Design a protein around this ligand. Structure first.
Ligand SMILES: C=C1/C(=C\C=C2/CCC[C@]3(C)[C@@H]([C@H](C)/C=C/[C@@H](O)C4CC4)CC[C@@H]23)C[C@@H](O)C[C@@H]1O
Length: 253
């Protein structure tokens, strides 16, 4: 059976598409406002050199900080999100921030050369740029694999925004108070996604797509964990806080 999208479900999708269009600039016109990217010579991938310089950290920190602000804006427009207590809203935002950023970044990722291309060459990020920010291949390699796997699903924008919403409204995040409420909200989003796929997504892969999408969420949890481990080590580097931002410090601290 392929039940049609209810009037409410269609409304949820419209609201999410609008939220994304208002919080994701496909032209990346704000990027020149971030601290400039600095790419030092490190063809050997020296951890000692990378940690002593962290030349790309200021730029990527601003990029991520900026993105967290956009994510907060997006999340506030998710139907039902504002019904939660502020305590639960903040817990959900802090816990999923990095995951949603990895998800939304897929829009600028390109399989042409396995990079995130944001306009001009200065704003093209490769594996080597992330290592210059203090992160290791233990995170980067699985991240690139994740980006490629996601690109291959060829998600409709409707599916993409629903996935980010579902990721944020997760009842199994540490410290959530009203898990039942959060679960009701996520279920409404999950059923909307499942219905949209069986109804609007053409074959091949009509079905199976939902399961592959849910598995990506599991993949994100793992990446989240590894990122946290690496952030901790990074915070041990003297004078590192100045290269970040208050928002990044709170969310990842
Ligand atoms: C942001 C974006 C983005 C790309 C994301 C990237 C490429 C550069 C490295 C990064 C930012 C990794 C990186 C592992 C995270 C890095 C943090 O620890 C930060 C240093 C403070 C996560 C997503 C990935 C560009 C646009 O797609 C908008 C989006 O919100």
């Amino acid at each position: 059976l392929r039940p049609k999208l209810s009037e409410e479900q269609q409304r949820i999708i419209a609201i999410l598409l609008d939220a994304h269009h208002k919080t994701y600039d496909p032209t990346y016109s704000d990027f020149c406002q971030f601290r400039p990217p600095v790419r030092v010579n490190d063809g050997g991938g020296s951890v000692t050199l990378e940690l002593s310089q962290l030349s790309m950290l200021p730029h990527l920190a601003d990029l991520v900080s900026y993105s967290i602000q956009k994510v907060i804006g997006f999340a506030k427009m998710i139907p039902g999100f504002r019904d939660l207590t502020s305590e639960d809203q903040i817990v959900l935002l802090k816990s999923s921030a990095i995951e949603v950023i990895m998800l939304r970044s897929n829009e600028s990722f390109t399989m042409d050369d396995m990079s995130w291309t944001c306009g001009n060459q200065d704003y093209k990020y490769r594996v080597s740029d992330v290592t210059k920010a203090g992160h290791s291949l233990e995170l980067i390699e699985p991240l690139i694999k994740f980006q490629v796997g996601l690109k291959k699903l060829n998600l409709h924008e409707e599916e993409h925004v629903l996935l980010m919403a579902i990721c944020i409204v997760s009842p199994d995040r540490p410290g959530v108070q009203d898990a039942a409420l959060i679960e009701a909200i996520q279920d409404r989003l999950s059923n909307t996604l499942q219905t949209y796929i069986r109804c609007r997504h053409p074959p091949p892969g009509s079905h199976l797509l939902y399961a592959k999408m849910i598995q990506k969420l599991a993949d994100l949890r793992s990446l989240n964990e590894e990122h946290s481990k690496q952030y901790r080590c990074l915070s041990f580097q003297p004078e590192c806080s100045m290269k970040l931002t208050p928002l990044v410090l709170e969310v990842f601290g």
